[PDB]
Amino acid sequence: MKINFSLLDEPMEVNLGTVLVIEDVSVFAQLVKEFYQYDEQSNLTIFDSKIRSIRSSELLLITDILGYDINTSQVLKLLHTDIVSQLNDKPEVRSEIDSLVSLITDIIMAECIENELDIEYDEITLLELIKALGVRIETKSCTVFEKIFEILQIFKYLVKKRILVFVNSLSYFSKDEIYQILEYTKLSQADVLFLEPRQIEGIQQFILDKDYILMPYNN
Amino acid sequence: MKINFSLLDEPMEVNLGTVLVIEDVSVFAQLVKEFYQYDEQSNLTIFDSKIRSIRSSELLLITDILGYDINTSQVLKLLHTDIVSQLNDKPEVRSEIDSLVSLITDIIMAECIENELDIEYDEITLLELIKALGVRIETKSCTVFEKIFEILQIFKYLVKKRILVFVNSLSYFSKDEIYQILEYTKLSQADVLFLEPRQIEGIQQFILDKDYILMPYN
Amino acid sequence: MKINFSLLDEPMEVNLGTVLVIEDVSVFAQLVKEFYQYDEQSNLTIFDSKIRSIRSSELLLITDILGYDINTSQVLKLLHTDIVSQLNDKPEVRSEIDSLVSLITDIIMAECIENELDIEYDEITLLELIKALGVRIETKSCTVFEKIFEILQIFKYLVKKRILVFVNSLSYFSKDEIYQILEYTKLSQADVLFLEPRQIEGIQQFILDKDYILMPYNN
Amino acid sequence: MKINFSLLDEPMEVNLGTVLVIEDVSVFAQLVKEFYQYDEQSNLTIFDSKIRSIRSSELLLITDILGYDINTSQVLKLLHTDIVSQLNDKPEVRSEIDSLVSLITDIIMAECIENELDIEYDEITLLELIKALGVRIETKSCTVFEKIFEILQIFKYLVKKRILVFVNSLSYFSKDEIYQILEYTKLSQADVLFLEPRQIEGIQQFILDKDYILMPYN
Amino acid sequence: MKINFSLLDEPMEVNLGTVLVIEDVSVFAQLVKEFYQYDEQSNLTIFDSKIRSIRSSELLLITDILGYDINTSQVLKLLHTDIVSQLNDKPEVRSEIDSLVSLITDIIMAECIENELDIEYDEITLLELIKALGVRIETKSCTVFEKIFEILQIFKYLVKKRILVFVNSLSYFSKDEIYQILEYTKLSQADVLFLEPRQIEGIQQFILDKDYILMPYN
Numbered sequence A, C: 001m002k003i004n005f006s007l008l009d010e011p012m013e014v015n016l017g018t019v020l021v022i023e024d025v026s027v028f029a030q031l032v033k034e035f036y037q038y039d040e041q042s043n044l045t046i047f048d049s050k051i052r053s054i055r056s057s058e059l060l061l062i063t064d065i066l067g068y069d070i071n072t073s074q075v076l077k078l079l080h081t082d083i084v085s086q087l088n089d090k091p092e093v094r095s096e097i098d099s100l101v102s103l104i105t106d107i108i109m110a111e112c113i114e115n116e117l118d119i120e121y122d123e124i125t126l127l128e129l130i131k132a133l134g135v136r137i138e139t140k141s142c143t144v145f146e147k148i149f150e151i152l153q154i155f156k157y158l159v160k161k162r163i164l165v166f167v168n169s170l171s172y173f174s175k176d177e178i179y180q181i182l183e184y185t186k187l188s189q190a191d192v193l194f195l196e197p198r199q200i201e202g203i204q205q206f207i208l209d210k211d212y213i214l215m216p217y218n219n
Numbered sequence B, D, E: 001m002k003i004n005f006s007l008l009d010e011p012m013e014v015n016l017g018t019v020l021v022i023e024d025v026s027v028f029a030q031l032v033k034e035f036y037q038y039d040e041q042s043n044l045t046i047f048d049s050k051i052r053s054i055r056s057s058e059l060l061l062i063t064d065i066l067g068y069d070i071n072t073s074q075v076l077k078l079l080h081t082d083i084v085s086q087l088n089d090k091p092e093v094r095s096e097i098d099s100l101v102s103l104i105t106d107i108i109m110a111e112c113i114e115n116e117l118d119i120e121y122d123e124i125t126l127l128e129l130i131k132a133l134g135v136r137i138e139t140k141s142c143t144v145f146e147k148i149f150e151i152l153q154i155f156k157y158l159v160k161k162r163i164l165v166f167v168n169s170l171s172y173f174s175k176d177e178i179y180q181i182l183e184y185t186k187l188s189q190a191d192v193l194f195l196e197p198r199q200i201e202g203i204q205q206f207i208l209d210k211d212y213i214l215m216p217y218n
C-alpha cells in the first residue's frame, strides 16, 4: 500500500501503522483537501502492490473521532456473524443454548396449540436471538482512545475499506496511548496512515520539512 | 344484519350464510362499485340489529379468494398480542420464560465479554421471541375451498369485522362444496353474504329480478 | 403466446383478446389454482413463439378488478415520461412552457439574490413539474368497466408483464362493453386471456365441455 | 457567553473569536469527551449573559471542517421556509407566480386531457417549486479556509445555535489565515471558541498550563 | 417599526418617540377604533423591520395614563420569576436562604408539635416568600408626568410588547415636559407613538391634513 504525491521524490510505502508529519501548513492542508477530494483530483495517487489505483470507496478517511458512526448495518451484521461463530466454536455452550431454545419453543408451541386458529412456525435461531438482544458497540461513554481502538477493531469488519487514514488524530492521545495504538496496529495487520502537522516524540515517523524533504525519524 | 339499497323496497336481513343473486349486470357492477366506494358513496347502507350505520373498516370485502393474504401486519400484531396475553395469564410459565431468557442473556453476555470489542445490549422480550419465531397463521392452502375456510376462520377470529362479503366467489366451488360452506357458516355463526350474477340451483338464495323485485328461492 | 394444460390435446394460441370458458367447475378451479401457483406447478405451461417458458414474474394474473392497485412507481414514472414525450412532440407548447419556467426561475433567482447567504440552484424541468403536479390515474370514482379499460391502457406501460389474464372478470360487463374491450384489445395488440365458468353469448370464445372437449364457438 | 469546568478557578468569558489552548493531553481529550457527552455529563457547563444553562441543541460542535455537510433537513427546511416568507412578504410577486403556475397547470392539464388514460392531479405549490429547483447553499469550497468561512456564514444564519466550537481546527490555517478568520469573526459578531493542544504564536489566546492555571497570552 | 392604513400613501416608520397628528376628527376616531379593534379589523396594519405582521398581544395601547395599573398578575408573575432567577443565579445566597427557611420551619414545626392538635405542613418556597413580602413596582406617582415615565419603564422592561401607543396623552404635559418625555424616549430606545387631534407647537411631529396628505413638521 504505497501512496505518492507530487511533493515526494519516490512513492512511500505504508505498512501497519504509519505516522506522516507535514511541517508545512500549506502542503498539509492541500494534502488533506486532496484526501477529501481524492476522486476528483489526480495529484494524490494511492496504489497497492498491483500498482492498481484504489477507488475513493475503498479509501477510508477519518477526521472527527467521536463524530464518526461506528454502528452500521454491515458492521453489526458481520459482528453478529462473528459472535455466532464464537458460539459455534464451543460445542457444549451451543448444546446448552440449543436446549434452552428447545424449551422455549416447546412452551410457545403449547401456547399456539391452545389457540383456536391453526398456527405454524419454523425455528428460533442464534442469529435471531442476537438480533433480538440488540448487540451493538457503545460509543456513548467511550473515551477518544477507546473510540479509536474500537475503530481499529471494526476496520477488520469493514470489507470494502482498503486503507484507514486519520487526520490530526494523534494530538489527543498520550505517547503511551500512541504506543498502544501502534503496537495493536502491528497485530491487527491493518494499514493505518496518520497525518499530523507537528512531529510526535518517541515514535518512528516520516517527516516532511518545509524544504519538502522527506526523511525517516526514529523519535 | 341488514343491507339496504335504493333498488330494494325494504331492507333484507343477512343472517349466517346468505346468497344474493343480481340478474342485472348494470345493477351488479354498480353494486360492487358501491361496495368498494361504500366509504365515498352514501347510496348503499348497512343497518345492524342495533339499527346503527357501520364504517367501512368494519366491513370485510373479499373478491379474490386466493389473492387475499392471510398474514398481515394487523393480523400478526393481534395474534402476537393474543399469544402475549395468553402467556401473561399464567405467571409461572412466564416466570420460567424469564428465567430461560435470563440464562441465554447470561451466556451471550459472557461471550460478548470474551470478545475484544466493546458490546452494548438492552434485553430480550417475549414479543421479540414470538416475532423471532415467526408465529403466523398457516399459509398452506391446497384449493380455494380450503382458502375460503381459512378466510372464514380469520374472519370469525376478527372481532372488528361485523360482515364478510364475497363477490362472484361461488363459481369456483361445486354444489356440494357450497353446501359444506353453508353448513360451516351456520356452525361458525359468522355473517357471510355472496353476490352472484346468475342463480345457483339446489341452494336457497335471494333472486333479484331485472324488474328490481326481490324474491326468495328454495 | 400459447398456453397448454394436460386437459388440452394441443397448445392453444392466445392472440389479442381470448375468452376461455371452462364448463367444469373442478377443471376451472384447478386451472385457476394452477394460475396462482404456476411457479410451483408444472402442469400449466405457457410459452411464447420461441417455446421458452415464461416466468411467473412475466405473467400478470388479475382477479379482483377494483382491488388491484393501478398506481405504481414504474407505471407513474413511465406515464410521466410519456407525458413529457407528448409535450416534446409539439415545439410551440414546449417553447411556451420554457418561457414560463424561465420567468419563474427569474423570480426565484431574484429572491435568492436578495438573501444574505450565497445560494446556488440548477434548473426546473418538465419532469420535475409533472412530479410536483402529482399526475396519477384516478381509480376512486371509476366504474369497473373504466377500471379494466385503464388496466388495458397501463398494460403497455408495464414492461415485465408478458401476458395479462383475468379471472371471471366478464360477468360484470355487458355484451356491448365486452365488445368494446375486445375491439380495444385488438388495437392495443396486448395479449389478454379471460377465464369464465359460463359462456358469453355473441363473442368468439373457446369452450371446454364437461367431456373435456375444446371447441371454438362463434357465439 | 462563558464556559466553566472543574479545572478552572473562575468561568472564562467567550466573546467574538476565542482561542483556548490546553497544555495537558488528558485534560484536552477529557474536555472534548465532555463536549461530545455534554448532554450526558454535567461536569462541563456553559452560562450565557443571562446566566442560564443551554441545551446541547443550542451548542454547535464541529471538529472536521471538510467533513461537515452544509446542507441538511433543518438548513434546507429553514432556507426554503425563509424564501417562502420572502415571497409571501410581496403580494404582487406571489400573485404573478400564482398566475404563471395556473398557466402551466392549464397546459399540463390540457395535455393530460388529450391522453386516452384518465389522469388526476392536485396542484402545484411554491414550496414544491423551490424544492423542484433544488435551492441550497453553495457547496463549492476550494480550501478549508473557505469552508470554515461558509461554516461561519451558516452559523451566523442559524439563530438557534448560540455558540460554535472548533476542535484542533487551527492547525490547517496559516497565521495570516488565522488573522483573517479572527477579523471575520469580529466582523460577524458570532461567538467562536477554538480548542488547540499547543499554543499558537502571534495571536491572542488563553493558555491553560499543566498546573491547571489559566493565563492570557498576547 | 412602521404603521400603514388605507389613508396613507406609503407606510410611515415609527422610531424612538413619534408624534402623529390627525386633523380629521372622523379619521382620528376611526383610527382609535381601528386601534382597539385591531384584532378584529384588518384595515390598520403594522410592519416591523422584519416586514412581519404583529399580533395585538404585542401591541401596547394605553389611553388613560392614571387609570392604567402598573401592578398586574402577569407583571407580578414576570417580576417574581425574574427575582427568582436572580436568586437562582447565585448558589451561595440561595443556600443561605434555604438554611434560614429551614431554621424558621424548625421553629414553627416545634411550636406545632407543642400544640395538642395534630398539624400537617408541606414546606416554604422562595416564590411564597416573595409573594408573602409583596414585591411589586412602586405605585407612588405624584403627577401624570411621572406616571407616564413609569409606563415607559415597565414598557421597556416588557420584551413581548414591541410598541407603545398613547391616544391624546400629550394634552396633559407641558411643552417642556414633552421635551423631557421625548429625550427620555430617545434615551430608552423604546418605540412610542402618540395620536393627537391637534398639532403641538415647538416639537417635531407628522401632520396629517384633512386632504389625507401627510407632511413633516419641525
Ligand SMILES: [Ca+2]
Residues within 6 Å of the ligand: A132, A133, A134, B122, B123, B124, B125, B128
Ligand atoms: Ca430487544
Ligand SMILES: [Ca+2]
Residues within 6 Å of the ligand: A122, A123, A124, A125, A128, B132, B133, B134
Ligand atoms: Ca425464525
Ligand SMILES: [Ca+2]
Residues within 6 Å of the ligand: C132, C133, C134, D122, D123, D124, D125, D128
Ligand atoms: Ca403537489
Ligand SMILES: [Ca+2]
Residues within 6 Å of the ligand: C122, C123, C124, C125, C128, D132, D133, D134
Ligand atoms: Ca432541478
